């Protein structure tokens, strides 16, 4: 684990890793590998990760012991069919269905895929079969919070009386279905977790596009001049009703009878048959259908065609660490400007409009789809006349908004539809209340080219570099030096500790821990001794002097405790500027469980930072931006 990891995945994700081409390998499992390492063994795969035990099924509900799952037959296609196919051609209908236990949002979600064979090429790696290289293992690619993960699973499916309890085909033979579903259950950690999930969700997972949805009950004015644009783009549209059948909106042209202009809706059914009383639809459908969902798509989906208008796109990542980057909500102006900040600059306009969504990454907590979600939301602000500057409390205490997301939901992903005058707009993703530990991704589907960046600082440290040469002592201080040490008349970490502590009686607080001293020293001991003379000790004393002015200039009490949110400010006073990530490491490595940084740590930090800096600065005498090191040398700096 450790930063090292979250940090080496960056160089890797920056290369390819995650994109379709190079999608991640869930639980570090290799298809080719395992497959190959299963044929040569003469065996059939056996997912040690997602065994065919009860726990894969569920916990409480489809949970063990429970009857819902009691007495079960994990049989593979072969063991129950004859010449099972993985996927054969592209029918005009689906034939798909759920067993007892199965849910039902899979039926719609899967269906669509079926009837757009290239969308299905993204999820199911059409290149598997029960005859050519069969080892009882298949794989699939799923999109997750911004990047593609690859899941390997064995074909043991849960039956009971030769009947498949979850997702399957009416007419046997094909199984890509039941498997892509076993897969998805795995990545989500179990079957029972699919129990709920939004058609709108699992579908983004299956494609990577963005799912916007509407209540036909009370729809928008431009409800129409959109679907057209929708299909027009390549997006997919569905529609359900309080009957319990999921349809598809395959298109709709406003055919004009030159006297009436009777626009129509070309609804379609995945399962084939169609029948009714009305017309296509008399658009009297709004009075007939209850729900509508259009899923605009990530442009590399249709790797060809040149049919359908292709969206534009840019996505970024961000986090909210409690007591530091977790403001969230205009309402809390005491933190809000502390959230992450990103720049979106619209060039030319329509003939701009953009889709913006804030989906929120998984969190240990959550065990079922839909459950345990945070209340995210987001505001966007108008740029007066300007990046390298993380917007301050002032900027928001000022400008009131300029269209803020239409509410904070208690759900994964949040999108809104915008259209704006080709200016630079800023947006502040965040949670409802403040202090909410969690991560996220912000995507953006536009119409024409968009430059998505981030409003934040850069590592910037420039302290006062004094060059007093064993002088500039004012003597009053000089005099008051040697008499503190003794013989050699130098100081030591521990000497410095008592010496220093013995220097207080103004205001919790209790001088500094040795560790601090230990590093106070470390930031100055050049000769490699382990002690300090007048010059450095001077710098220290004075540096301290400065430091201390700030803790106090802010701990406007007698607490000897300052709110973590202060620290950002603070660091600025001490001449340190850093992007969101560090402050987190700074509060994570330095605050309290209550989110208070005592004075000692406050300085243990300021000091240490300066040291590590200098060491870095010093070692990069040319300013290339990188400081190469071998193990040994690394291990030395490493230990503090």
């Amino acid at each position: 684990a450790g930063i090292a990891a979250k940090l080496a995945k960056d160089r890797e994700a920056a290369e390819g890793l995650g994109s379709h081409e190079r999608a991640i390998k869930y639980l570090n499992q290799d298809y080719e590998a395992l497959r190959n390492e299963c044929l040569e063994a003469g065996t059939l795969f056996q997912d040690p990760s997602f065994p065919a035990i009860p726990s894969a099924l569920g916990f409480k509900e489809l949970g063990p012991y429970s009857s819902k799952t009691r007495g079960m037959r994990w049989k593979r296609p072969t063991e129950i069919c004859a010449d099972p196919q993985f996927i054969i051609g592209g029918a005009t209908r689906t034939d798909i269905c759920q067993g007892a236990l199965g849910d039902c949002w899979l039926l719609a979600a899967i269906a669509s895929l079926t009837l757009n064979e290239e969308i299905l090429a993204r999820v199911v790696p059409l290149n598997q079969s029960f005859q050519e290289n069969y080892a009882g293992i298949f794989h699939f690619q799923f999109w997750q919070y911004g990047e593609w993960v690859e899941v390997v699973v064995d074909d043991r499916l849960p039956t009971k009386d030769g009947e498949l309890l979850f997702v399957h085909s009416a007419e046997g033979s094909e199984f890509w279905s039941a498997l892509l579903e076993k897969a998805y259950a795995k990545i989500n950690g179990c079957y029972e977790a699919l129990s709920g999930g939004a058609t709108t969700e699992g579908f983004e997972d299956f494609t990577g596009g963005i799912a916007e949805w509407y209540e036909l009950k009370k729809p928008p004015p431009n409800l129409f001049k959109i679907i057209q644009k929708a299909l027009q783009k390549g997006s997919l549209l569905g529609c359900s009703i309080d009957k319990g059948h999921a349809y598809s909106v395959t298109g709709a042209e406003e055919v004009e009878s030159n006297g009436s202009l009777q626009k129509l809706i070309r609804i379609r059914n995945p399962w084939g048959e169609v029948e009714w009383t009305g017309r296509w639809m008399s658009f009297s459908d709004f009075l007939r259908h209850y729900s509508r969902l259009e899923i605009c798509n990530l442009t590399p989906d249709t790797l060809t065609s040149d049919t359908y208008k292709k969206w534009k796109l840019t996505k970024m990542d961000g986090n909210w660490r409690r007591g530091s980057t977790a403001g969230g909500c205009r309402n809390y102006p005491n933190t809000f400007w502390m959230n992450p900040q990103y720049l979106i600059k619209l060039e030319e306009e329509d003939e701009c409009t953009f889709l913006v969504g804030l989906i929120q990454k998984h969190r240990r907590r959550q065990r079922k789809m839909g459950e345990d979600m945070h209340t995210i939301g987001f505001g966007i602000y108008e740029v007066p006349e300007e990046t390298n500057i993380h917007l301050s409390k002032n900027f928001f205490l000022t400008n009131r908004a300029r269209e803020r997301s239409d509410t904070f939901i208690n759900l994964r992903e949040v999108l809104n539809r915008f259209k704006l005058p080709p200016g630079e707009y800023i947006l502040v993703p965040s949670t409802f209340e403040p202090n909410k530990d969690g991560d996220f991704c912000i995507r953006v589907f536009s119409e024409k080219k968009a430059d998505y960046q981030a409003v934040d600082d850069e590592i910037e440290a420039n302290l006062e570099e004094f060059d007093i040469s064993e002088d500039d002592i004012d003597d009053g201080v000089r005099r008051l030096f040697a008499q503190l040490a003794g013989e050699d008349a130098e100081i030591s970490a521990f000497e410095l500790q008592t010496i220093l502590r013995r220097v207080l009686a103004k205001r919790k607080s209790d001088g500094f821990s040795i560790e601090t001293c230990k590093i106070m020293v470390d930031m100055l001991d050049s000769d490699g001794s382990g002690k300090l003379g007048l010059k450095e000790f001077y710098i220290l004393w004075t540096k301290i002097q400065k430091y201390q002015k700030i803790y106090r200039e802010i701990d406007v009490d007698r607490s000897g405790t300052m709110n973590s949110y202060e620290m950002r400010k603070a660091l600025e006073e001490a001449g340190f500027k850093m992007p969101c990530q560090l402050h987190q490491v700074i509060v994570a490595r330095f605050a309290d469980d209550q989110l208070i940084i005592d004075f000692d740590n406050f300085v243990r930090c300021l000091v240490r930072l300066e040291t590590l800096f200098k060491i870095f600065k010093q070692l990069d005498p040319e300013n290339t931006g990188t400081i190469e090191l071998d193990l040994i040398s690394w291990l030395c700096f490493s230990v503090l």
Partner: protein, 176 residues
């Protein structure tokens, strides 16, 4: 299939973070100071709130100041791999270690042990006279071990040489 001591600890977790299964440095500290501040044949006042803090940041890949229960195990285990060495080299029961036996416990923890590096250790965790208590001894290895890994991670191929940009640096270095 985990030992009984882990089970009781496991139980101690859910009772804190619940399903979130996480502990904070502080939390980790007592959770640790009550299992080692037990059996007398080993002396110490307990892990200081800084030692735990590195234990936590060193195992933290999401920068939240929390220790996952699985990541906990890893550490705890290593802690035990060393709650030995030390206990074996501190016979004085004074709760420290021989200045010239220090180089003895660190080879009993399997390390390259270089001159320069040594000092570093000595100047950072030992007492005025040159002695290291249980706390700092163990606290050292976590952190040490961490860097041996952080380096192994940053170096995918094997050019026995990692390379970092400043942010990468301040991170590795600052979160420990």
């Amino acid at each position: 299939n985990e030992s009984e001591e882990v089970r009781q600890f496991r139980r101690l977790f859910a009772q804190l973070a619940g399903d979130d299964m996480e502990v904070s440095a502080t939390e980790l500290m007592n959770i640790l100071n009550k299992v080692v501040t037990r059996h007398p044949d080993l002396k110490t006042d307990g892990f200081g709130i800084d030692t735990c803090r590195s234990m936590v940041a060193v195992m933290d890949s999401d920068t939240t100041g929390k220790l996952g229960f699985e990541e906990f195990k890893y550490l705890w285990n290593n802690i035990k791999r060393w709650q030995a060495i030390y206990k074996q080299f501190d016979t004085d029961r004074s709760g420290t270690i021989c200045s010239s036996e220090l180089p003895g416990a660190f080879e009993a923890a399997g390390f390259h042990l270089n001159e320069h590096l040594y000092n570093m250790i000595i100047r950072r965790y030992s007492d005025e006279s040159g002695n290291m208590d249980f706390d700092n001894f163990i606290s050292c290895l976590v952190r040490l071990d961490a860097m041996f890994r952080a380096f192994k991670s940053l170096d995918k191929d094997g050019t026995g040489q990692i390379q970092v940009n400043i942010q990468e640096w301040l991170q590795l270095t600052m979160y420990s």
